Design a protein around this ligand. Structure first.
Ligand SMILES: [Mg+2]
Ligand SMILES: [Mg+2]
Length: 218
RNA sequence: AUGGCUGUCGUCAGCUCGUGUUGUGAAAUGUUGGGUUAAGUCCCGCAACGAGCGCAACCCUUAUCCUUUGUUGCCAGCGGU
């Protein structure tokens, strides 16, 4: 709400012409983001997220770029919600019947990796199990407790995970995702202009959204 | 006209299916890409996520040792020839 003004961003020298009504002219061969349309649009998204959080809709925090890959996990897991920080598996939302079998394996291997096998088979075989355990856990993480399809999708990056936005679009899942000056503002339910690939910027949204979801919990 | 049983490509490393996505469609992706192996063998990336038949292992023989038994098999230490 025009507090710090630290998400100018500009994301590149060039632009995306579909982002014309959300920019301010910059002489440094870059493109400003107009905060006047940024603040109210963020407020609308927060209000609708509060609206839908009253039914435990399982909001998803999807930030994959290495800048936000930790802050997203913190702001999602450590408070109430799910997340996807590593590579978005192709079709994990629409090929749900096939993806769920992987989470079943993750749960079984987690059960057998605590009081299970330590010497029953070869130590290198247990190492293979641990290797697969880490590979499956880091890629397929917080969504492990998912009951099925979610209700909302909060996507940190804009262009990085177009397959995530399209996967949500195939269903009737609303999408709240911030959009840079070089991204595509179409197909996203709630346009939020702003910079993404910065530490401060992602933390701003991951704090605001986290507080809103916490207060909408009950 | 067939069953069964064989050779061959070739012991070559390939051949496929389910769901998802792409294309009006035939089809494609998975199975491509950077490395490595004898092998789509393995790892990392990745609109793909998994599974099957293959490869490897599971099997017989050979290279060393330990245990059990000592015949029609053996003769190191003891005595007679
Ligand atoms: Mg093919
Ligand atoms: Mg194989």
């Amino acid at each position: 709400m025009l507090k710090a003004g630290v998400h100018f961003g500009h994301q590149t020298r060039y632009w995306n012409p579909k982002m014309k009504p959300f920019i301010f002219g910059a002489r440094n061969k870059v493109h400003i983001i107009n905060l006047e349309k940024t603040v109210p649009m963020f407020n609308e998204a927060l209000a609708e997220l509060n609206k839908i959080a009253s039914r435990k809709g399982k909001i998803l925090f999807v930030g994959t770029k290495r800048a936000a890959s930790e802050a997203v996990k913190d702001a999602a897991l450590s408070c109430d919600q799910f997340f996807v920080n590593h590579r978005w598996l192709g079709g994990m939302l629409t090929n749900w019947k096939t993806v769920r079998q992987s989470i079943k394996r993750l749960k079984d291997l987690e059960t057998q990796s605590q009081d299970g096998t330590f010497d029953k088979l070869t130590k290198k075989e247990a190492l293979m199990r641990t290797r697969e355990l880490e590979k499956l856990e880091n890629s397929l993480g917080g969504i492990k407790d998912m009951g099925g399809l979610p209700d909302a999708l909060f996507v940190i990056d804009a262009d990085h995970e177009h397959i995530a936005i399209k996967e949500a679009n195939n269903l009737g899942i609303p999408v709240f995702a911030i959009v840079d000056t070089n991204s595509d503002p179409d197909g996203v339910d709630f346009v939020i202009p702003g910079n993404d690939d910065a530490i401060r910027a992602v933390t701003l949204y991951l704090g605001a959204v986290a507080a809103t979801v916490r207060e909408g919990r009950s």
